[PDB]
Each structure stands twice: as C-alpha cells, then as structure tokens.
C-alpha cells in the first residue's frame, strides 16, 4: 500500500490568500517544478493593454453596489453576484455574459458587492496525483453552486504566437473570433488552474471578467462552480472541441463518466456511425 505524501506545503509560495498544498498517493512523481507559479497574468512581450484610468466605465454608487443603478452591474445587464459573492441561480451557465466588476474609478468602497474575482481565492484546494490524468485539483471542502474558485492565470500571448507554441496543453483562447485575439499560455508561467483537468461532466465554468482595466482584448478567465461540489471532488471544466479536435490524436479522455464524449470508445463509435 503506497502512503499519500505531502510534497509541497504551498505551491503558490505564499502568493494566494490560502495555501495550496500538493500530495501524492499514487506514484513516485515529485512536486511539479517545470513551470513558474504566478498569481496574476504576466507578459513576455509588449501587449499595450489599455490602462488609462479615464477610459474606465465606472459607477457613481454610494451604496454597497447592490441597487439596479450600479452602472457596473448594468454593463452585464445586472450584477450576478448575491450577498455572499455567488452567482445567482439564473446565471446563464451555457453562454455566460461578460462581467464588469467595480474598479479604481468607481465611487464605491473596496468591499462593495461587485468585487468577487478581484478579492482572490477563498476555497481550500489541493493539487493531487490522479490515477490516469497526471496532476489534478480537488476541493478540500464543500463548495456551493456559483462560488468563485480561481482564475486561469498565465502568460499573455498573441494568437500567432499560440500557433507556434511547441506545448499546447495549457493554451486558453480569450476570444473565439478571427483577427486581433489573444491567449493565455500557462505552460511556463501559471497558477493552480494550469492543473485543472477536463471533465465531460464539468463542475466549474469559465467566465470572462474585467477588473482593473476594460481592454476587451484581455478578459480575465474566472472559474465558478456550476453546481454544488462535494468535499474531495476533482474540479474540472469542458476544455471544448478546439482542444479535443487537435489533442484526440495524441491521447483520449480518461474522465470515466457515462457522458464522456472524448474517450477512445466514444470516438471509435462515432467513426463507425
């Protein structure tokens, strides 16, 4: 019987609100150190993100920003966060809206109701060794539906640069369209989200969010729970077909769900009819 070992007390080296430990109860693989943990997105060439403070849409609220008069809320039709910072039950989990959180130009206070993602990680997460999918991340607590989990953080690169990257296991496209579009690559520089696996039955969803800037080329990718999550469950999202159409030649899905769309069996069956 192999023991579960604690192999890193905090993969974030103190950068997150909470520690993110790393365990292994499966094999001999030591803590992964082929990348640089960063808590906030980085740049390795000039992106000219629009940071002009006078370009910010901002509210005039003197409330805690819970009224329908918050211009920030209005920018996503309404504010989708409840009094505890969770997405409302009616949130569109299929086609999420863009969220505009409050910013430095708003008249409101730092602890207003429209600042969830910018306040960082609050749930307890763990990096662990899975049986078949290398490293994954699991929850150390119950997580109610709509709760902010973590951001997909990494190195901002152009679409053309993403097209020439040797490792394509950590590329997240910020926009699905043509033209001047950007990507987060978490291969070399990333946060805990770089270890989140694909599940054909996902329990978290990615949502585009604006905080300190509103450059629409550079939304930030926030993961929220899409259902109540039980203690110990692996976290996972649907990576999508722009991933699997390429990756399925190299490996197939090991999520093990009855709903799996990307296993060897699901693929071979589709090939047949």
């Amino acid at each position: 019987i192999r023991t579960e070992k604690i192999i890193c007390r905090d993969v974030a080296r103190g950068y997150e609100n909470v520690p993110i430990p790393c365990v292994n109860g499966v094999d001999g693989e030591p803590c992964p150190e082929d990348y640089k943990y960063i808590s906030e997105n980085c740049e390795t060439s000039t992106m000219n993100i629009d940071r002009n403070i006078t370009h910010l849409q901002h509210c005039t609220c003197v409330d805690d920003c819970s009224s329908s008069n918050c211009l920030c809320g209005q920018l996503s039709i309404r504010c989708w966060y409840d009094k505890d910072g969770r997405l409302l039950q009616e949130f569109n989990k299929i086609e999420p809206p863009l969220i505009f959180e409050c910013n430095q130009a708003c008249s409101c206070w730092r602890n207003c109701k429209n600042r969830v993602v910018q306040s960082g990680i609050k749930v307890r997460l763990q990096l662990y060794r899975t049986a078949k999918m290398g490293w994954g991340v699991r929850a150390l607590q119950t997580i109610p539906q709509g709760t902010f989990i973590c951001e997909y953080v990494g190195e901002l690169i152009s679409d053309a640069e993403a097209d020439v990257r040797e490792d394509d296991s950590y590329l997240f496209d910020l926009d699905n369209k043509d033209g001047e579009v950007y990507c987060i690559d978490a291969r070399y520089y990333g946060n805990i989200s770089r270890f989140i696996n694909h599940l054909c039955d996902p329990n978290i969803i990615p949502v585009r969010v604006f905080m300190l800037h509103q450059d629409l080329r550079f939304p930030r990718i926030a993961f929220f729970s899409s259902r109540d999550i039980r203690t110990g469950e692996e976290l996972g999202f649907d990576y999508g077909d722009r991933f699997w159409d390429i990756k399925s030649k190299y490996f197939t899905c090991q999520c093990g769900s009855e709903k799996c769309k990307h296993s060897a069996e699901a693929i071979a069956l589709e090939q047949s009819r």
Partner: peptide, 8 residues
C-alpha cells in the same frame, strides 16, 4: 488552428 486551445 494549428495548436489546441481551451475555450469557453
């Protein structure tokens, strides 16, 4: 595209 991309 030439490389795999996660996407919403």
């Amino acid at each position: 595209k030439q490389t795999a991309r996660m996407s919403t």
